[PDB]
Amino acid sequence: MEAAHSKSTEECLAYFGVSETTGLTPDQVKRHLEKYGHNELPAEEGKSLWELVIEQFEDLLVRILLLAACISFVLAWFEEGEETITAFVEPFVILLILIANAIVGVWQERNAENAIEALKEYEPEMGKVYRADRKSVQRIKARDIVPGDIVEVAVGDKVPADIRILSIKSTTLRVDQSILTGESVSVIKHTEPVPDPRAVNQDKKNMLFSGTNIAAGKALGIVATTGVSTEIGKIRDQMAATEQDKTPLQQKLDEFGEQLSKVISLICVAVWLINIGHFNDPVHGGSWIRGAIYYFKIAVALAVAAIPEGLPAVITTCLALGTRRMAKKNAIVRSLPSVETLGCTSVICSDKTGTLTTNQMSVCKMFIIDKVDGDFCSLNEFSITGSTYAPEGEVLKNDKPIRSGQFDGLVELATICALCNDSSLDFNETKGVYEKVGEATETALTTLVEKMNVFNTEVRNLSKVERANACNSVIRQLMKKEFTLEFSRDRKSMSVYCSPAKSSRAAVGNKMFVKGAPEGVIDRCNYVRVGTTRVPMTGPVKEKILSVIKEWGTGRDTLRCLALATRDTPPKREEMVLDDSSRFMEYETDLTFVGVVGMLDPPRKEVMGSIQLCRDAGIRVIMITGDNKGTAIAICRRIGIFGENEEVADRAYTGREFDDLPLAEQREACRRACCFARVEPSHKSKIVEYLQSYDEITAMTGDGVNDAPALKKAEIGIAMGSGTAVAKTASEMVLADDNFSTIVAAVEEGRAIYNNMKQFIRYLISSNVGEVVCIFLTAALGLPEALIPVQLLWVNLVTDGLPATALGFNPPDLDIMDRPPRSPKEPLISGWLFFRYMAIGGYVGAATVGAAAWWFMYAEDGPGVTYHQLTHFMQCTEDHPHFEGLDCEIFEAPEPMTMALSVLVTIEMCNALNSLSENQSLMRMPPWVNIWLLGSICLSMSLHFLILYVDPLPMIFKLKALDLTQWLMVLKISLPVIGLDEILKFIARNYLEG
Numbered sequence: 001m002e003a004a005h006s007k008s009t010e011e012c013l014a015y016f017g018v019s020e021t022t023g024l025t026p027d028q029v030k031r032h033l034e035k036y037g038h039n040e041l042p043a044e045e046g047k048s049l050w051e052l053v054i055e056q057f058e059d060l061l062v063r064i065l066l067l068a069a070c071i072s073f074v075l076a077w078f079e080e081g082e083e084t085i086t087a088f089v090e091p092f093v094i095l096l097i098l099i100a101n102a103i104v105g106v107w108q109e110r111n112a113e114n115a116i117e118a119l120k121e122y123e124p125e126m127g128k129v130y131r132a133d134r135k136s137v138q139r140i141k142a143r144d145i146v147p148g149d150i151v152e153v154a155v156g157d158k159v160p161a162d163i164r165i166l167s168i169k170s171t172t173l174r175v176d177q178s179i180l181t182g183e184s185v186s187v188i189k190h191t192e193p194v195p196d197p198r199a200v201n202q203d204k205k206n207m208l209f210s211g212t213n214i215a216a217g218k219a220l221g222i223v224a225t226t227g228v229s230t231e232i233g234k235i236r237d238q239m240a241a242t243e244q245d246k247t248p249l250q251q252k253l254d255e256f257g258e259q260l261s262k263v264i265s266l267i268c269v270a271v272w273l274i275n276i277g278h279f280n281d282p283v284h285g286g287s288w289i290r291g292a293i294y295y296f297k298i299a300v301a302l303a304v305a306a307i308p309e310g311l312p313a314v315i316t317t318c319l320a321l322g323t324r325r326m327a328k329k330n331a332i333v334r335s336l337p338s339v340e341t342l343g344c345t346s347v348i349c350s351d352k353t354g355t356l357t358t359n360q361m362s363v364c365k366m367f368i369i370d371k372v373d374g375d376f377c378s379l380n381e382f383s384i385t386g387s388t389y390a391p392e393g394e395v396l397k398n399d400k401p402i403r404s405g406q407f408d409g410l411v412e413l414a415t416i417c418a419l420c421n422d423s424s425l426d427f428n429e430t431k432g433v434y435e436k437v438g439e440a441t442e443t444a445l446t447t448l449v450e451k452m453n454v455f456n457t458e459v460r461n462l463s464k465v466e467r468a469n470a471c472n473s474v475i476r477q478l479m480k481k482e483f484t485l486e487f488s489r490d491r492k493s494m495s496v497y498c499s500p501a502k503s504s505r506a507a508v509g510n511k512m513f514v515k516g517a518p519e520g521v522i523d524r525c526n527y528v529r530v531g532t533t534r535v536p537m538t539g540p541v542k543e544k545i546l547s548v549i550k551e552w553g554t555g556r557d558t559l560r561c562l563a564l565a566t567r568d569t570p571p572k573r574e575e576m577v578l579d580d581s582s583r584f585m586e587y588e589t590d591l592t593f594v595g596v597v598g599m600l601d602p603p604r605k606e607v608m609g610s611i612q613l614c615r616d617a618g619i620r621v622i623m624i625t626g627d628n629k630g631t632a633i634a635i636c637r638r639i640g641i642f643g644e645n646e647e648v649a650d651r652a653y654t655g656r657e658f659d660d661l662p663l664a665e666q667r668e669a670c671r672r673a674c675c676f677a678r679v680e681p682s683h684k685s686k687i688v689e690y691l692q693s694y695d696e697i698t699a700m701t702g703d704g705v706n707d708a709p710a711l712k713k714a715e716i717g718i719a720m721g722s723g724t725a726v727a728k729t730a731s732e733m734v735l736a737d738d739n740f741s742t743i744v745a746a747v748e749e750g751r752a753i754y755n756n757m758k759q760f761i762r763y764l765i766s767s768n769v770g771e772v773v774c775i776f777l778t779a780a781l782g783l784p785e786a787l788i789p790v791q792l793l794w795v796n797l798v799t800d801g802l803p804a805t806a807l808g809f810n811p812p813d814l815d816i817m818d819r820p821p822r823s824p825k826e827p828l829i830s831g832w833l834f835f836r837y838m839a840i841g842g843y844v845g846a847a848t849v850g851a852a853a854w855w856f857m858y859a860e861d862g863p864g865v866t867y868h869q870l871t872h873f874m875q876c877t878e879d880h881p882h883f884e885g886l887d888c889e890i891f892e893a894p895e896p897m898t899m900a901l902s903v904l905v906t907i908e909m910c911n912a913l914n915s916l917s918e919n920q921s922l923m924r925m926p927p928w929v930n931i932w933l934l935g936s937i938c939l940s941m942s943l944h945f946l947i948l949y950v951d952p953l954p955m956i957f958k959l960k961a962l963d964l965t966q967w968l969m970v971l972k973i974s975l976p977v978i979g980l981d982e983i984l985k986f987i988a989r990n991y992l993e994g
C-alpha cells in the first residue's frame, strides 16, 4: 500500500523501488505477496442467509392462506361438538402445503446459485504487467498483482487494482467510473498530481480504480493498492443499492393473481350468502351463530382451495431452474429476466468479428507493387503459412519460400506492421501456446513481422519466450515512436509519428505509418510505393489495388483486409492539434500506398447450425459489422444467412448507403436487410432502435467495445466470454463458453418456461372450477351438504400442492421450436383457453356431485335406493312426505362424502395427466415425460389412502370407502375427463384456422 495518491510520478516509482521500464523483480513480487496478500476480495455473500431465502412467504396468495391458518386456529380455540381433533388439524393442513412448496423453492434457488458461483472460477481474470523476468509485457493472473507492479491497460480492459497513472500512450484516456463514482459518462484522466490527500474520488483525476472499465485510450501505471484496501473494496460489503425486480412475466402473473383473488372473494361471499336459510337448520342445534360460524368456515376452506397458492413458488422454481440450466450450458445469467425475454425474441442482431468468427486472426496473403507503367500495374503477391499466433511460418512467392528482406516493399510493410501497433505477443509456458496481448487484428500483424524477419535477425538460439517479440524489437529500435494517433472509427484508421533513433544512423526525416480499412486509406493516398521509389497515384493503379481486395474478400477464404501506407512528408510536430479527434483524419492525408495484408478469420462451427434453428423458430438474424461490405456478404453466404447464389442487392447496406436513405426507407431497410457493413457504434444502436419501433423483441450479440451501445438498448444483450469487459458490463447474459449455440437453447428455455406456466394455470383453474361448481350445484339443486371445512382443506393439499408444483418440470412441448415467436402483446389467457377451463371444470364439478348421488340411488350396497328423491333435509327430521317408509338419518351418512371427495381428488390427478402439453395428446407425449409429476400423483393418492385405512384417521375425516365397486365407480367416472380434454386437445390441434 502507498497511503497517498497525491505523490508525483517519481515518488511513486521510488516509494516501491521499481523501474518504469522493467517492473518488479521476481524477488520483490515474492516478498510483496507474503506481505500485502493477493489481489482478492472475499466472495461478497452466498445470498442464502438460510433465512432470507426461506422467507418467501411474501406473495399475496401465500399470506392469504397464512390468515386462514390463524382464524382456523382461533376457531379451534372455541370447541364445538368435540371438533378439537378436527379443528386443530384445519390450520396444519393449510400450513403444510405452504411448507411443501417453500422447501422446493428454496431448494432450486440455492441450487441455482451454486451453479452461478461455480462458473465464476471458470476463466480467471488476468492483467497486463511488466516484470523483470521477461523483456516484453506479460500476462499474469489478476489476483497475483501486488502494489509496486507496473500495470498496462487499454480499451475494453477492466482495471485490476487501484493504479497511479504513470504515462498515457494515447492522445486521450477516458474511463468508465459509473460503478464507483456514479459518473454515468466517461471522464478524462491525466498524470499531473492533485495535492489534497482527502479529495474525493471524482477529484482524483489521475488514477484507475479496480472494477472500472477503460472506455478509450491506452495508459501505463503503477499499482497503488490491491485487495480489500482497494477503493472499490471499501464498498464491497458496506455500501450498495442492490437491484432486484420482477420480470415482465412475473409481473404479469401478479396482476393475474390479485384480480383472481378478488373474484374468489366474491364467490366465497356468494357461497356464505346463498346458505343463509341453512343457518337455523338443526345440524348445529339451529343456533343462528353456531350455524353462521360453520358456513363462515367453508368459505375460508373454499378460498384456500380455489386460490392457486403454489403460483409464487412455481415461478421462482422455473426461473431458478432456467438459470441453473444455462449455467450448465456455460452461460452466466447476469439479469434474471433475460432467460424469459430471450424466449419471445424475434430478431437477433449479431456482431461479425469475434462474435460469429473465432477471432483467430492470422495473415495469409499480402501484396506490394511490382511495376507501374502507364495503365499497367504489376503486383508482387505473397502467401504466408501459419494459422496461429506462433512466429512459425514461411513467406512464399510463386509457391516457394523467399527471404522477405529481398523485396524493399516488404521491409516498409513489416516496419508499418511493427510500429503502428499497440498489441504485442506473450508466450504461455503452461499452455505452451502464444497468446494475443491486445487486439487480435494487431497481434495478427505482430506474428507476421516475426515470420517475415526482414532484417535477418538471429532468432534460432532464442527461447520460446524471447522469440515472440524478436523481429519486432529490432524494428522498434530503428525509429522511435514519438506519439500515437489512436484508433477513432470515424476514419477507420490508426497512425503513429516516428523519428529516426540516433539521428545519425538515419537522417531520412520524420515519417507517419498509417494502417486502416482499405477503402478509406486508399482514398487518402496520392502516391504509390514502387520498390524504393514513389509514383503518383492514378486511376488504373487504384482500380487494380481495389479489385484484388474485392477478390480476396469475396473468395472461398473470405479474407479480412487492411491497407498499409506511409506519409513521406509529415507536418512538423508543433503544427499538429492533438486535441480534436475529428482532425486526425486530415493529418492522415497525402499518403503513399505500401501494401495490403489479407487476414484469415474462420467462422465458428456452431453458427451455421444455430441459424438453421432460428429460421425454423421464426427468428431473423442480422449481421452487423464495421468490416468490408464485400467480406460481410461473403461471410453471410458461408454461415447461411444468404444463399450460395442468392441475389442480395436490396438486403445489404453500408454505413453511408444507410445514411443516404430517408428515415422512412431506413426503417424499411432494417426490416428486410440481413447484413450491415462499414457501420459505426452509432449505426449499431440505431439499427436496434429501428427494430424496436416495429415492436420487435430485439437481441444483440457482441464482444468488443465496438457495440456496447447496441447491447444496452437491445431487449437482451449477450456478450462473448473472450470479449472486452466494456461489453460484459452492458450485457444481460455472458457466454463464457464462446458457444453461439447456447443462445438457441436459451430461446428454447425461454419458450418452455412460458409454456409451463400456461399448464400450471390450466390445471389449477380448470380443476378448482369443479371445486366451486361442486359447492354451488348441491345448494342450488337442494341436495345435502357433500363436503366439509376440513374436507376442502384435504382436497387443497393433495390436488393443489406438489402435483401442481411438479408441472414446472414438464419437458419442452414438441413443436415449441417450430412455432413462430410469442408476441408480448398476447393475453395471458385467450378467449378459447377460458372455454376449456370451463369444459373441464364443468365435468369435474358434475362428476363429484353425481358420485354422492349415485350412492344414494344405485348403490344397492349397505344403504339402498332413493330413485327419484327431492331429498328434503327434513324427511328424516320429521315425516312430511307422508312416507310409510321414512329411512331415518340415512342422509348425512359418511360414505357419500367419502365417495364424492375421492372423485374430486382422482379426477384432478387425471386432469394433471393432461397438463403435460397444451394441445399434444397423450399419444405423442405419454404421462412418463414428467417423472416428478407421476411421483407427486402417487404421493397424493397414497397419502389419501392413509386417511381411509389406518384406523384412527377416518374418524378425523369421515369413514372408509368400500372395497371393489366403489373405487371402480370413482375411477370409471373420473377417467372420462382425460378423454374429454383429449378431444379438446384434438379439436384445437386441427382447428387453428381463423
Ligand SMILES: CCCCCCCC/C=C/CCCCCCCC(=O)OC[C@H](COP(=O)(O)OCC[N+](C)(C)C)OC(=O)CCCCCCC/C=C/CCCCCCCC
Pocket (backbone or CB within 6 Å): 096, 099, 100, 103, 104, 107, 108, 111, 321, 802, 805, 806, 809, 932, 933, 935, 936, 938, 939, 940, 942, 943
Ligand atoms: C406407496 C404408494 C406411492 C406413495 C407416493 C409417495 C411419494 C413419496 C416420494 C415422493 C418423491 C417425489 C417428490 C416430487 C417433489 C415435487 C416437486 C419436484 O418435482 O421437485 C423435483 C426436483 C428435481 O431436482 P432437479 O430439478 O435438480 O433435477 C433436474 C433433473 N432433470 C433436469 C433431468 C429434470 O427436486 C426438488 O425440487 C428438491 C427435492 C426436495 C423434495 C421436496 C418435496 C418433499 C416434501 C416434503 C414435505 C411434505 C410433508 C409430508 C406431510 C406428511 C406428514 C409427515
Ligand SMILES: Nc1ncnc2c1ncn2[C@@H]1O[C@H](COP(=O)(O)OP(=O)(O)CP(=O)(O)O)[C@@H](O)[C@H]1O
Pocket (backbone or CB within 6 Å): 351, 352, 353, 354, 355, 439, 441, 442, 487, 489, 492, 493, 494, 515, 516, 517, 518, 561, 562, 624, 625, 626, 627, 628, 680, 704, 706
Ligand atoms: N487496431 C486497428 N487499427 C487500425 N485499423 C483497424 C483496427 N482495427 C480495425 N481496423 C480497421 O478499421 C475499420 C474500423 O474498425 P471497426 O469498428 O470496423 O472494427 P471491426 O468491425 O473490424 C470488428 P467487428 O466486426 O466485431 O465490428 C475496420 O474495418 C478495420 O479494417
Ligand SMILES: [Ca+2]
Pocket (backbone or CB within 6 Å): 304, 305, 306, 307, 308, 309, 796, 800
Ligand atoms: Ca388451492
Ligand SMILES: [Ca+2]
Pocket (backbone or CB within 6 Å): 351, 352, 353, 354, 355, 702, 703, 704, 706
Ligand atoms: Ca467484435
Ligand SMILES: [Ca+2]
Pocket (backbone or CB within 6 Å): 305, 767, 768, 771, 795, 796, 799, 800, 908
Ligand atoms: Ca384442487
Ligand SMILES: [K+]
Pocket (backbone or CB within 6 Å): 712, 713, 714, 715
Ligand atoms: K434494456
